[PDB]
């Protein structure tokens, strides 16, 4: 049973952003964000990703402004003292499907759909885990009976998860002309979530490559400097008047 408690390990997929000089597939990011805002935004919330984060990554500023203007947001008290509602702006954050955690639990039968902002860093082996969990909605083995209201997922720690399979084949219509298969949606959503959890990957990797190279050159020079300074001592001949 300890095997079931731990959960089935997830493999190592060759992600397009995995390497030392590979970047996010921004088309995949855009598609994954579309999938999130269409199917996943009904239950899970990001609440750490502002709309302004999308410009220059997946969308243009006009597109982001239109998308923000699509939704409504409550605003601070007006001159009359009432809490009114206005269309969203570029600087607002992603909306929350539920007012509070207790509301989310009541809606979802006691299960709290976790915030997806850092889901690829919160879970061990986050990217592979999320992709496998989304796509690995298989049939339970012989003898195991999941309590009613739950769905079996081998990669979920415990065996049974509260969400059903949401990445149903043919659930979204991509705006670019990509067939929406379950694996396609899984890869796109994981790319989007991994960007949302680490928007600094490209700049971070560029800085790392440059500074590793430059500091290796510095290390070579420092070794030469040390060998030059110590060359006087390490090649001296001293006569000591003693033998044994």
């Amino acid at each position: 049973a300890d095997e079931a408690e731990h959960g089935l390990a997830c493999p190592s997929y060759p992600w397009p952003h995995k390497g030392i000089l590979s970047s996010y597939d921004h088309a995949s990011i855009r598609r994954g964000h579309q999938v999130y805002t269409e199917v996943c935004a009904s239950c899970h919330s990001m609440s750490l990703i502002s709309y302004r984060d999308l410009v220059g990554v997946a969308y243009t500023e006009e597109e982001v402004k239109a998308m923000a203007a699509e939704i409504e947001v409550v605003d601070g008290p007006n001159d009359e003292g009432e809490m009114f509602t206005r269309p969203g702006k570029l600087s607002d954050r992603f909306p929350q499907p539920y007012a509070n955690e207790a509301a989310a639990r009541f809606a979802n039968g006691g299960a709290y759909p976790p915030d997806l902002s850092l889901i690829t860093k919160a879970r061990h082996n986050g990217q592979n885990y999320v992709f496998s969990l989304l796509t690995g909605y298989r049939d339970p083995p012989a003898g195991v009976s999941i309590r009613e209201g739950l769905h079996y997922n081998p990669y979920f720690p415990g065996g049974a998860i509260a969400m059903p399979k949401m990445l149903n084949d043919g659930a979204v219509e991509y705006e670019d002309g990509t067939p929406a298969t379950e694996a396609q949606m899984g890869k796109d959503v994981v790319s989007f979530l991994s960007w949302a959890a680490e928007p600094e990957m490209e700049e971070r990797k560029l800085m790392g490559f440059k500074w590793i190279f430059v500091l290796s050159l510095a290390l070579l020079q420092a070794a030469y400097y040390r060998r030059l300074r110590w060359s006087v001592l390490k090649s001296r001949k001293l006569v000591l008047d003693v033998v044994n």
Binding site: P16, A27, M67, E175
Partner: protein, 60 residues
Amino acid sequence: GGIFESLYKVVMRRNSVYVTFVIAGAFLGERAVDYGIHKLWEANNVGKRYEDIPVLGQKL
């Protein structure tokens, strides 16, 4: 040998000139390394950058 001695007599007779040379070389080397790493980045991951998605401006 001759080239190193020639550049030595050019730029290593006053420490102020040497400091100016060090700063200028640091700046130029930094910019050159930036350019080279950026070219390697472009060569490696082609078809993924922001200004490459086919539908970048059609969400209106």
